[PDB]
Amino acid sequence: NNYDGDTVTFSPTGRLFQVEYALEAIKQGSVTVGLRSNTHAVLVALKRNADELSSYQKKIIKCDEHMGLSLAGLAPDARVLSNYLRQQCNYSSLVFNRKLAVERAGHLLCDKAQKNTQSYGGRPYGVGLLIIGYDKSGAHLLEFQPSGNVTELYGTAIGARSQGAKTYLERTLDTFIKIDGNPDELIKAGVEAISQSLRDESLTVDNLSIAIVGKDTPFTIYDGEAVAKYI
Amino acid sequence: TGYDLSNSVFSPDGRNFQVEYAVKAVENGTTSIGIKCNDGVVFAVEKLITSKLLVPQKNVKIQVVDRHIGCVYSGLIPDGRHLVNRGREEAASFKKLYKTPIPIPAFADRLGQYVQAHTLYNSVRPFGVSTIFGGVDKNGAHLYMLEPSGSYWGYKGAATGKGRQSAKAELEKLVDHHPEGLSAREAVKQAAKIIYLAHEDNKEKDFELEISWCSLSETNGLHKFVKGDLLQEAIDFAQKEIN
Amino acid sequence: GSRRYDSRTTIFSPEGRLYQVEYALESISHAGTAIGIMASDGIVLAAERKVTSTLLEQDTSTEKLYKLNDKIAVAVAGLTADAEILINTARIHAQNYLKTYNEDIPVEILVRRLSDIKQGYTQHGGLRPFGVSFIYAGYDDRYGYQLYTSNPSGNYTGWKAISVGANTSAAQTLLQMDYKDDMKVDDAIELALKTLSKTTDSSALTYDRLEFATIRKGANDGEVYQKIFKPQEIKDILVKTGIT
Amino acid sequence: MTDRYSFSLTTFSPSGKLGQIDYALTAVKQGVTSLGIKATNGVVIATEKKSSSPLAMSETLSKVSLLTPDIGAVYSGMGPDYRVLVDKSRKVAHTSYKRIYGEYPPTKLLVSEVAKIMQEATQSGGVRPFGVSLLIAGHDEFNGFSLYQVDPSGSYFPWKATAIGKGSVAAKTFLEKRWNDELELEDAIHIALLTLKESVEGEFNGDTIELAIIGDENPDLLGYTGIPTDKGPRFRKLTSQEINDRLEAL
Amino acid sequence: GYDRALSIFSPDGHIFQVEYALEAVKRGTCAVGVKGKNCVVLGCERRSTLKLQDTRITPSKVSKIDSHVVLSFSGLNADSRILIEKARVEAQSHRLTLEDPVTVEYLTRYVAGVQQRYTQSGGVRPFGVSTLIAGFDPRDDEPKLYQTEPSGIYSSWSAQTIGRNSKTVREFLEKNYDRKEPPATVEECVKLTVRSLLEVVQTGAKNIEITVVKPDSDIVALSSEEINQYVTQIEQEKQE
Amino acid sequence: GYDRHITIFSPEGRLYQVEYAFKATNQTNINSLAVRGKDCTVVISQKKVPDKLLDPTTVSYIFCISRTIGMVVNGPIPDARNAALRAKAEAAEFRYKYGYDMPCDVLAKRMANLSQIYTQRAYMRPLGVILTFVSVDEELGPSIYKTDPAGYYVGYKATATGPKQQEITTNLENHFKKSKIDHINEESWEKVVEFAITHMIDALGTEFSKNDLEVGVATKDKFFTLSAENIEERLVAIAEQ
Amino acid sequence: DRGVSTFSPEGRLFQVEYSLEAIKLGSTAIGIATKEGVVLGVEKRATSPLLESDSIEKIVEIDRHIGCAMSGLTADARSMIEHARTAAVTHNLYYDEDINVESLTQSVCDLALRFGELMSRPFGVALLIAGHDADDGYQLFHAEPSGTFYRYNAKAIGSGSEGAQAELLNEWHSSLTLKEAELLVLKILKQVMEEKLDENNAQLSCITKQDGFKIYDNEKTAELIKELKEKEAAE
Amino acid sequence: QFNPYGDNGGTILGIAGEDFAVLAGDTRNITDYSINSRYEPKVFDCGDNIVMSANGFAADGDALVKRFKNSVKWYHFDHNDKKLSINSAARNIQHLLYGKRFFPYYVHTII
Amino acid sequence: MDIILGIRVQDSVILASSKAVTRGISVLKDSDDKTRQLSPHTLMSFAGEAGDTVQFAEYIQANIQLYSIREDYELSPQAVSSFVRQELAKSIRSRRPYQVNVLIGGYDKKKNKPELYQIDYLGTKVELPYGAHGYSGFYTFSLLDHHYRPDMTTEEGLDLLKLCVQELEKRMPMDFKGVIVKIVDKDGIRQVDDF
Ligand SMILES: [Cl-]
């Protein structure tokens, strides 16, 4: 109310409204899902168009050969943050000949988002991210919130109506975590997960976006006729 | 009025309302504690399990500074990470110039001055965390608790978060019942009990326990996480006491 | 942050005026009147000191009339402290030009630069404008005798006769009435003193409440002399025209 | 972080007033009375030493300060603001004059530099004006003795005699009746003590009054001999005992 | 450094500081540009609440940017000096690197770019000035007239006016200027320009300035008597 | 009314942020006192440790600035420690630059100058603290100099600070009216400490255990704080008379 | 007031949303993409009849293979175009090749959110970027001050946009010839414009692989206007 | 005085056929009259069917290859995974080298 | 570069400047004009380091032209010469100093007098009846010391200049390919085409 003019102000109950308003931009975003087994990690994203004459806004971005993310909210902010991750992954490779641990990737995003919540003039990032990767400790899934909070999960979803997929994955937990050495089945589970968040619209060929990374699979994105297999 | 709209402004009382508002963010956070013992310190924290989908043991909240200091905090988690990052920078520059690892009182003032600095200007926000931290140096064990204002003291026991009062009461009993001192292994068990007892004030979601310790005899003066057999033993001791 | 306490000194009103410039001009309208009159054989500068006390040291005093170089002087209306900042800049600028070209600075060039500094404080930097209006009196070998005025906006104009500060409206009407082009310095001296005497907010115009200066070619052959009048000389010139 | 206040805190109001300068002058009005009188062979500056507690040692707090060997300063208004102005004034007499010309600045020019510093606190970003009026007394070879008043705006005026602060209105009127252009330094000291008694309420002695003169050169206060051209400071602070001697023949 | 964003969007999509800068232009003395078949004429109003002026030394309303291009304006006088100075410096810089004087379009594009920059830079307000820029490109005889405004937009005009009561004189020019047949001579162009100002001015005495620019750096300012002859002639044809 | 939020003048020529910083001074509800002997300067302050979980040895408002200078603070501990670190750094630099130990009064002036800046510059708040500096200066002898959020400073024969400062001040005034001298006419610092505690007891009307007090003593070439047992030894001596 | 980079309670940036209102006040610009080329058309909208309309420049070349149309505060577009041209030429210097249309568009959009307390405010202009490259063929992009860009088969921006876009939804198919697209832009511009459309108050342009980006003469557009009026009368 | 350059010896050779190209190099690495390694490869696959060798001062050789390999990576990131053609690689490598015109990479480069 | 000469007579200043541009063992050009017009009645010739000469000349030209447009007025030859001196005096303590020697010939319209200034790269200015830069002076100064009179006509000045060029063409080691001669008087600057 009187305490939402900027990020540098606490409300009387200890809230940061600018950060909460940034969180709200994610809620308006198109649904995206993340889930993993012990061998692979999979992103599934519902893409959104302006109208029938426009393209469908790309939701998934590659960060390295072993890492990448999906976005929900302000897309330019995802471009800034993904670019930062690309550099951090890159620095680790050039200087230490070391693939950046997905966990460190999370810590780095947390700290970058945090600085924008304590200084005057700045604003919080207005995007949520789901980071998947395969590193020296196996497959991983992370959830990034622009409050700075990063969380490691077996599965999750962010965006409008993400609660449907998040409930489904919570039920399916014991099944999909043991889909080891089978990419097409882990994707099927993710495609069924994102279906619990659809209303009046169904998954089409220029609507669905799937990404996968794992033990013997570089981070690769599927669009167009390559996702027809899964509808 | 309007005295509460800007950091670093004195109210007619002589108070900085923005700091007091940051304290509200801390009171909203989960419970974390510190127990000082014979030759070290023990840290424990409540991790609310929001969903089945959280990977157990894999969202670590206790943080190490240098190789001998442990830090835990309640409130805005990102703010706590910022403070630890600074703590690590301070500790590195102390070790660079003076060779010896940073003493705990020295480290306490480094964090204190840095947090106090975020109450001096209207262009920054106060920290939304109270931080319990400590370790072992050349003069033995030290436990500290630092608040958003920059205020810190040495503690026999310390608690912050939603279950702070419950935990404080439990801490005071230990201080009264053990005037000679508590052992490191005993303090680990007690930490588990107190977190379980302090969980009553946050009992909707069930939780995951996380413990760490520094002890001159048990961990050789270095910070280590309590895992496996020692953790399950501490969990069981706590489970027996609530029933 | 600090946005809360920003007055925004360099913005437009809905009517397209600059608030701070307008308010600075309002401040200047309460300062003691200063008059400049340009004759064919010289220039007169006359200014009224702000309500004097009997224990003020009158001879070792300077408030209204300042020397920029040997050929240019200014009359001040507004905050004196603001004026000295600008006067020192102007003095340095004159010397820079002399050092560069080995010729004394043409009056307009000096007036333009000082006016440009004022302009800047109204467009960028978030600072309050200088609360000062100048009357420039000077000579150069291109235009001869020249009078200019500049104000807080950084706008400057040239004049045959002009007033700044208090009661300019009444002073200008009186100057417009009795001024003519073939006028001599000694006639201009009289007009200046007569105008101040009629527009003054005091009971009677006396020597101790005035600063006076002339810029004549009344030296010896083709060169210009600046005469900042001493107290006794103002007392005499006030008697010579029969004001006291 | 960093000073985000890069804008003026003193601005013109619709009526033309500069609010913060006016309010600074109001602070000066509340301040304890100080005065200055110019004689033919010297200048006296005086003020009351308002003690904050009887446990305080008022000798450790100097209201009259030496700026150069021939220039002294006193004030009315805010003490802390005055103290830093004295530091800055002493330095600028060196940096912008002595280090260039190998001699101390004449009174009018040092006064001019202090006025500049006070003017800038009226226009620069993120600062309030100084809450003090200064009275600066001094001597220099080509101007003789002089006395100046510097106000929060940065304006300065030369005075034969004047007062500033609490009871300045009455003190100025008192000085007008007593001042003539033939006053000898001792006559000016006498009038200074008389004028101050009107504005002082409690104890009136050499421990509650601070008074300094600008007069003859003091070779005994130089600290060395052997250079004929160096003859000693003209600034001298009268001792507590020297004040009481003059308070008997009052 | 002072950083404040002074020019910002309002809920309806307007930038008020730019729009208020246009009001300052509307307050300024009227300026008019008319281009003929072989010339451009710049006419300027001078307000007469100022008697006792010295016209020898007072800043003229039309300024030479180079020997072949001129600039007149409406709005804040102090603001215009900054634009004129920058334009004059760019004029010399262009001659130095390209070895050719500026085109009128290029000089205008530069002046407009400066104005635009002051609408999305921190710590500055927009220029309270609109300009008429007229002249002839090097080795070209086709007349050029351009107009700029505080926002930064610029365009070419057969004839245009800015300043107070400019809407009245624009009305006059809109029915009195034939695109198919522009004023064939200097005399015709000066007259149509003087006529348009007389709709708004008052006395045709020391209130109107006229500057004529012809090809190949041929710029001259008319004197009082020369202009007064146009005023006298127009009034006698009017009584009909 | 934004003139009450930053350090600009109010219409009556006041600085409210400075005034409110003075009120922050009493936020700890602790009273301090300083007196001078022939050879020493003693400063005492109340020690209130309400929480049983606190380590009482870490609760302190007296600081050793240099080997010769001590400082007690009245005000919140974050601002108190901010002032102490700056004072330590300033005193260390002075010694390096000028080749001799920083005098108590010069450090006081310097800290007072810094405080003055916060009353004039907008981006910096005043510190809500009053700083009392003590030493046995090699030129001036036993010295007490005190700083506040206004940037004011002065030397004292003796002084007191805190919520109940006026009671202690008049108590000390009345003693020096009687004794007719500027100090405590005593040989040992032990008895000057005893005088200090005695006159604090009378003025406040409370009894003290060894853990209710905090004592700093400045002698020639060193300032030191007393342990609980040093104070207990001192409390016993007062009781047995 | 309030920070320039402030979020609304609905999770949107005030200044970005307000600049979108400025663009709705701008003159109409339409683009249609075919397999034979991309057509860009704009309404000139002269504020007065004395203004020489051919000096109104709202269609602009970025490189031989990339063109651009604008709507809103058009003065804001100058530095965007300057950046676009430098980005395009610089990429050719560094890589001895043409820069992809999407890469160009992404580069321009990187400027967009570089405002705050960097420039003082967002741009008040939207851009239609049309071009060809060997990888993805003929492309049309809508670049907004939000930093977001969408690929379009057809798109209208400005005051007549929502009406013109609804018309483009009905008319566009994947087999349109270049000539068919030219006429369609003219037809839809004539519908949403205030004054009557002719060769002086509207401008056409296209980009083809073979001939690159070309702004049409007033003579060439006039004949397409005549061809359009005749075809509408012919049924 | 410190000499920032050295000479690691070895030699390289590139030949192009109608539908193929070879890039060969010996595996010996030396300083002065000593052998550092009998097998230290200096011909590298940089992705997008480009092979590269920078022969001379091995520290500069490795630094350049490292920077170009990284350049290929970012070319994909910035231009929708587009393949970097050999002519575009060549132009890019010119700028890598000329950027250190006044402190050169001490190598002969062949791709 | 190499040969630049100047003669001030009764009513004009005459500047003669060599036409050759030689680099190594090749004369690259034999029609080079080593001069810039700074204002209608002010001309500057220059000799010195390659690149530096034209860069400095054109920089000065731009500044004087800028001044002219700003003030609608022509600076006096004295004023222009003082500006040029100061620029060179600045330059001599820069990281890389301009190695350019100049002569400035002007007609002061306010005084109705010709004026010739010699300024070297250090910023050493002198007003002279006749001037030269480089090795040229070693032949021409003594020659002019003998034959020059202060009241000579422009024609007499040109004959006096022919005598200098002839001496240089006889005794100088290098072929400087003749001179371009320009006259500065009350009517401005004009070039003699047949020399
Ligand atoms: Cl200081």
Side-chain angles (χ1 to χ4, degrees), chain A residues 18 21 50-51 53 55 79, chain G residues 7 106 110 151-153 165:
Chain A
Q18 277 300 300
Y21 296 167
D51 55 36
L53 263 33
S55 56
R79 173 163 163 73
Chain G
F7 277 108
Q106 179 63 265
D110 281 348
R151 194 183 160 175
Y152 276 96
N153 290 136
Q165 189 70 10

Side-chain angles (χ1 to χ4, degrees), chain A residues 35-37 39-43 132-134 139-141 186 211-214:
Chain A
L35 83 168
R36 74 156 184 99
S37 71
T39 59
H40 296 76
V42 168
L43 290 167
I132 59 161
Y134 195 93
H140 299 273
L141 164 70
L186 226 199
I212 185 164
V213 69

Side-chain angles (χ1 to χ4, degrees), chain C residues 96-97 99-103 106 108-109 112 141-143, chain I residues 67 70-73 75-76 78-80 82-83 86 110:
Chain C
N96 280 347
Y97 191 97
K99 179 182 156 54
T100 301
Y101 301 105
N102 253 70
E103 289 177 357
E108 201 206 347
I109 298 176
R112 196 201 294 118
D141 67 0
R142 186 188 176 177
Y143 291 119
Chain I
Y67 192 105
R70 185 183 298 118
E71 310 298 339
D72 191 40
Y73 201 68
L75 246 19
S76 75
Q78 201 290 125
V80 168
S82 292
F83 171 75
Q86 195 182 51
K110 306 213 86 164

Side-chain angles (χ1 to χ4, degrees), chain E residues 199-214:
Chain E
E199 298 292 298
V200 165
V201 73
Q202 175 60 32
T203 353
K206 289 165 185 69
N207 285 355
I208 292 173
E209 278 179 12
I210 298 292
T211 307
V212 183
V213 45
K214 277 171 278 183

